[PDB]
Amino acid sequence: NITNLCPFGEVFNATRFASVYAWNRKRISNCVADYSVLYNSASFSTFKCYGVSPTKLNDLCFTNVYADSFVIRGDEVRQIAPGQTGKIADYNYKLPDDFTGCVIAWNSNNLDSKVGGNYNYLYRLFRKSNLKPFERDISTEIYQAGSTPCNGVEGFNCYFPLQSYGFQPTNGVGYQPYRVVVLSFELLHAPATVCGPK
C-alpha cells in the first residue's frame, strides 16, 4: 500500500522549463497517478502514447515513472518520437525505437516569449555524432569544423555548439514555444511503486 498522489504539477505547472539540450528528468515513485487529469485536460496540443493506450493507463502499476521536460519550437515536436531525425532528435533528445510511454506538448507562448525574443532557451546545433537513445550532452565545448583547433567562436571553422531560439510572441505557430513532457514507464522485475487509482 501507498497513499500519495503523484506530483505531476511539480513537472507540468513548473515556472521554468529546461533547454532541450540540458533536459530535466523527475523520478515519480511511491504515489498513485490518475492519468485522466492528463489526457482529459484540454491543455495539450500533443498527447501521443507508444506501447500503451492512454485510456487504459490507470489500470497498470509501474516500478517507476520518469518525466523529461524541456522546450522546443512547435515545428520540432514531431521529432520527439521513435525513429525521428533532425536537429532535436539527433543532437538534443532522441527517443528509442522500443520506446514505451507518452509524449505530451503544449503551447507556451504566453510564458516563454519576450517582447524582443527569449534567448534563454537553447538547442544544440553541432555535434560530432548523434546521441544514443536517452543520451544527454550538456557540454559547451567549441565545435571544430575544420582541420584547425578551436578556442572560441572567433576562430575560423570554430562554431559555437548551442543556438538560441529567440522566442518572440509574433512568430508563426511553428516557431512558438512548446513545452514537452515525456513519460517513460519503467517496469522492472522489482516491486511496482506507482499505480493507478482505486
Partner: antibody, heavy 111, light 108 residues
Framework: EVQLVESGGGLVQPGGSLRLSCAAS????????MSWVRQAPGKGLEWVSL????????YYADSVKGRFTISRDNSKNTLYLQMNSLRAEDTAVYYC????WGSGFFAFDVW | DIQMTQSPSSLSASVGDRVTITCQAS??????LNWYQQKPGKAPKLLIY???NLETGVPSRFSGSGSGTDFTFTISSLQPEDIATYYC?????????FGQGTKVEIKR
Amino acid sequence: EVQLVESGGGLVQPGGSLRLSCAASGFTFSSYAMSWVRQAPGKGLEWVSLISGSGGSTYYADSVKGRFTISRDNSKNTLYLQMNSLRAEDTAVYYCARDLWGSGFFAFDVW
Amino acid sequence: DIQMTQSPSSLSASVGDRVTITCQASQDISNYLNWYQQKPGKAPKLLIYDASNLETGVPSRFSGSGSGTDFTFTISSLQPEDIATYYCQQDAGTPLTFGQGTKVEIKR
C-alpha cells in the same frame, strides 16, 4: 546491490603512465554514463572525465585533456582511465561514479 | 567554469541543532545543483539531487532548497553520525564543479 570497485592506484614517476580500472556489478553497466572524480589529499573534489553508456561520447576537464582517456568494455563491466604524462598535481584518490539516471551529467549516485 | 562557493567552510553545532549550509553559484543555474556527504576515509554520499529531491535511503532530516544562485542544504536535527564534509556540485555545464566543501563538527 550496486558495486563499483577501483583498482590500479600506485606510485609512478612524473611523466609516467597508469591505467585505472573500475569493476561494476549489480546493474546493467552498458546503460549508464560513468565518470571519474579525483580528490587531492585534504582538498575538495574535481570531476575528471565522463563516458556515455555505449562509449561513443567522452568528455574531459581541461586540466587533463589529451593526457587522460576514459574508456569502457561493457563486456567485462569495466570502466578504464588511461593516464599518461602524469604530474605531481595528479596525486589524488580516484573514484568511478555512476550517473543517477544513466543519460549523462546528472548526480553521481554510486561511488 | 561555474565557480561554486560554500559558506561556511566549517561549522560546529550541538547534537539536535538545526544546521544550514548554503552553496552560492556564480550564475543562475536553475535547480541544477546536487549535494554530497563524505565521512572521513570514505567515499562521497549522494544526498540531494536536483535542488530538493531526497535520494532513496537518505534520512529525512536532510533536505535541500533554493534555486538560481543561492542553494541551501539543511539538517533538521544534527546527529553525531553526521560528522562529515558536505559538498555542493553544479549540474548546469561542463566542467562539472564542486564547492570547496564544508566540515561539520559537533559542539559538545
